[PDB]
Amino acid sequence: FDPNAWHHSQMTTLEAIELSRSGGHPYSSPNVPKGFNTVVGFFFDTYDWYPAAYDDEEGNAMKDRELIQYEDWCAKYARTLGLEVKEVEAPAALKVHGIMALKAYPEALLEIRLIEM
Amino acid sequence: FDPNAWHHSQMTTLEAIELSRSGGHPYSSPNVPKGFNTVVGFFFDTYDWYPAAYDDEEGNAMKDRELIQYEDWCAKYARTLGLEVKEVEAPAALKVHGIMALKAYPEALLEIRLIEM
């Protein structure tokens, strides 16, 4: 374990630790229109991120079987319900895995899937 | 057994039995636009109705605690999501309790609450 190593969250290990202790996370997208969020963003806005969360995935949250399911569900119901879906820039921690952009869904839809079910 | 005694579903006892045996129910509304349905309509379109279902309520399905919850849920999320909500004529089995109209929600919204949850 090295303190100075670059963490897969695209910051120093120390910075990752400070970020997690402050209740933050690295997976928020920039310039997300108000009332929208990405699945991964809303998930860690709700639940706690800890630096070792995606060690096995080398930081690629979008390999999480849990988050993939949520993403598939949100895509499905936003379409059948005629909801607006926005495209937003991926966070650096996902840009480094080849994900350039993410779908952002209405927060009410995320609330149903991520909190109620 | 009186086959011609009036059932609270607003048909003869015999008629209610025959309707139940054919997989029908008395709680559908007339002239519901395609892709919409009421809570009570969708519920019994999904699950089996039997004549004695609402003996205790003298046929007022909208006194069912479950169905009240589903209705409250759909009104809440239809509003927050900005979904279209239509007003439709109540079926006779509810007009007899003073309910003149029911709210009709998008079928996708009903699928979530009544089947997935």
Side-chain angles (χ1 to χ4, degrees), chain A residues 1 3 5-13 15-17 19-64 66-93 95 97-117, chain B residues 1-17 19-33 35-57 59-62 64 67-95 97-117:
Chain A
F1 166 91
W6 192 240
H7 191 51
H8 49 59
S9 62
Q10 298 308 297
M11 66 202 331
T12 64
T13 293
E15 275 163 338
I17 288 291
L19 180 57
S20 177
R21 291 186 199 295
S22 77
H25 68 95
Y27 293 116
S28 288
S29 289
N31 305 109
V32 183
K34 299 287 188 309
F36 292 78
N37 208 352
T38 68
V39 166
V40 70
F42 188 99
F43 185 95
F44 287 105
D45 279 3
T46 299
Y47 308 102
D48 287 331
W49 176 74
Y50 63 106
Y54 295 119
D55 274 356
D56 295 353
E57 292 78 19
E58 297 200 45
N60 195 1
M62 291 324 307
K63 287 293 193 202
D64 191 341
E66 182 180 8
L67 296 194
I68 294 167
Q69 281 169 11
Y70 298 158
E71 176 66 35
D72 288 346
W73 186 98
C74 290
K76 184 179 180 168
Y77 279 101
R79 179 191 66 234
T80 55
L81 291 171
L83 294 184
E84 189 171 9
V85 177
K86 301 268 191 197
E87 191 157 349
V88 299
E89 202 179 344
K95 290 254 217 188
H97 292 92
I99 302 157
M100 288 298 98
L102 287 169
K103 249 67 186 179
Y105 302 98
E107 284 188 311
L109 183 65
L110 292 161
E111 190 190 349
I112 297 161
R113 194 44 184 105
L114 289 193
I115 304 179
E116 304 225 352
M117 302 172 53
Chain B
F1 169 65
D2 190 354
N4 298 111
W6 198 239
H7 196 248
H8 50 68
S9 58
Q10 299 306 289
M11 65 204 329
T12 67
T13 301
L14 181 67
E15 278 167 341
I17 291 174
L19 181 61
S20 173
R21 286 166 67 214
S22 83
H25 68 87
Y27 291 110
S28 288
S29 281
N31 305 109
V32 183
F36 289 72
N37 204 350
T38 69
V39 164
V40 71
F42 188 104
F43 184 92
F44 284 106
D45 280 4
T46 296
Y47 308 105
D48 287 335
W49 176 74
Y50 61 107
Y54 293 119
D55 270 358
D56 294 348
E57 294 79 20
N60 191 358
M62 286 329 278
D64 192 336
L67 293 192
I68 293 168
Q69 287 167 15
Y70 299 162
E71 175 70 41
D72 287 340
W73 188 95
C74 291
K76 178 191 178 179
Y77 280 103
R79 177 186 64 241
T80 48
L81 290 174
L83 295 182
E84 188 175 9
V85 175
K86 287 156 177 334
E87 196 157 27
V88 297
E89 201 179 346
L94 294 180
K95 281 187 190 179
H97 292 93
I99 299 150
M100 293 295 111
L102 293 165
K103 245 66 185 179
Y105 302 100
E107 283 196 315
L109 184 63
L110 291 159
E111 278 174 16
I112 294 162
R113 193 45 184 106
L114 283 64
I115 305 178
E116 303 216 4
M117 293 176 48

